[PDB]
């Protein structure tokens, strides 16, 4: 029977992009309730144990966090299954290093090291606009942040930049044609291109057409488009491969020609 909410996760039921092995276990870490959806996050334990390899077991992760070393968006978090997600920054002040979560072009989180002056801000997509009591205007972002008194030009689907020490808005990018974006869901996940057309339907879903640096074309539902730069230039540094999504025949040929992986 199901008389209330569930609190376990089977390892074959867990999100594919975490890359968990088949044979160590029956269970996987259930992500803690928080700012990002269960299908769309990376639990902090998988980042420290499986990606960075600073710990060999979940107990070695627990005694890294309880020493207060780990910051997410500039706040110290002691919870080992906290749901980190897209555009967040992780700082490890004791080893002296900083990371940002961004998609690899195969649709998984890359490790991406950043300089300490770039670790001071993040980019946020707008979800909602509304007016409260005494006529005060409010804004809501993709990561549950609520802001009072936004600039009256900031509309739906726009991108805003915030400083992490104060949480207030600094600058913004309008959703319109010719701006650079990244794709955050569907089959096109982890690709980058410029917006070239928006096609709209009254009821059901709008569709956006996007163009690559190499001149390829692709499309997706409007809910999967995140804007990252005015015109041709991004407001964030980008990982190896820059979102170009080369095919399996091109990938074979570079792997043979470059002789990488200790050939």
């Amino acid at each position: 029977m199901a008389r209330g909410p569930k609190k376990h996760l089977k390892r074959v039921a867990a999100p594919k992009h975490w890359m968990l092995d088949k044979l160590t276990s029956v269970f996987a870490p259930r992500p803690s309730t928080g700012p990002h959806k269960l299908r769309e996050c990376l639990p902090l334990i998988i980042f420290l144990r499986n990606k960075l390899k600073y710990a060999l077991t979940g107990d070695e992760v627990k005694k890294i966090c309880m020493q207060r070393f780990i910051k997410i968006d500039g706040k110290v978090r002691a919870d080992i299954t906290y749901p980190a997600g897209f555009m967040d920054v992780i700082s490890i002040d004791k080893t002296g290093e900083n990371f940002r979560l961004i998609y690899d072009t195969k649709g998984r989180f890359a490790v991406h090291r950043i300089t300490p002056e770039e670790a001071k801000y993040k980019l946020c997509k707008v979800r909602k606009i509304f007016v409260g009591t005494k006529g005060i205007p409010h804004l809501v972002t993709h990561d549950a942040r609520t802001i009072r008194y936004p600039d009256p030009l900031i509309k739906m689907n726009d991108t805003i930049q915030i400083d992490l020490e104060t949480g207030k808005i600094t600058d913004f990018i309008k959703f319109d044609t010719g701006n650079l974006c990244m794709v955050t869901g569907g089959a096109n996940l982890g690709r980058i291109g410029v917006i070239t057309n928006r096609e709209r339907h009254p009821g059901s879903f709008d569709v956006v057409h996007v163009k690559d640096a190499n001149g390829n074309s692709f499309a997706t539902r409007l809910s999967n488009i995140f804007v990252i730069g005015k015109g041709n230039k991004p407001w964030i540094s980008l990982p190896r491969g820059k979102g170009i999504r080369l095919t399996i025949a091109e990938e074979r040929d570079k792997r043979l020609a470059a002789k990488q992986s200790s050939g």
């Binding site: 089977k10 088949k22 044979l23 160590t24 276990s25 029956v26």
Partner: protein, 65 residues
Amino acid sequence: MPVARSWVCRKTYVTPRRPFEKSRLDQELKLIGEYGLRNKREVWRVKFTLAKIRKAARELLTLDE
């Protein structure tokens, strides 16, 4: 009960349909004697890997160049 095991496995040979075909019996024994094998199953393994190779090449030859 749930368990951390896995259950994937497969067979690596097939038995012939005619058990006592005279033309088949001495052909298989000549391959055993020339290559120094233990039994008939050790020949039926090699016929099965060749059949799977030819089954794949016959599919790819249907598609456009």
